[PDB]
Amino acid sequence: AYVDVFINWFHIKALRVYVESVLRYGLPPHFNIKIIAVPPKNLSKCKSELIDAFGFYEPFVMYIINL
């Protein structure tokens, strides 16, 4: 289950990301969406860095942190 439900949750997250990128970002659908496994201590910095590099509940396009 820690694999099957894991895959189910990943697919659900992909669906949510598609829904957000089809709502926040506008049609026609397109996305440079990419998931970065951040260094353990860099998560706060990346949010600070990304929100800095964001042409804007997270603002701009979806930046929902995973796990």
């Binding site: 506008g26 049609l27 026609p28 042409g55």
Partner: protein, 51 residues
């Protein structure tokens, strides 16, 4: 920022147009199929009565 507001308005208009076009295409296809099926059924019933 004017470009962003115009982009948002264009995105809303494009979403509306895409939804309308998809609905119209689905309606047209379903209507054509249903019309063909109903014509075939009516012709078959009339032909059975005539036979």
């Amino acid at each position: 920022t004017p470009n962003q507001v115009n982009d948002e308005l264009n995105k809303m208009q494009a979403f509306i147009r895409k939804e309308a076009e998809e609905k119209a295409k689905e309606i047209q296809l379903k209507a054509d199929q249903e019309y063909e099926i109903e014509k075939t059924n009516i012709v078959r019933n009339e032909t059975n009565n005539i036979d």
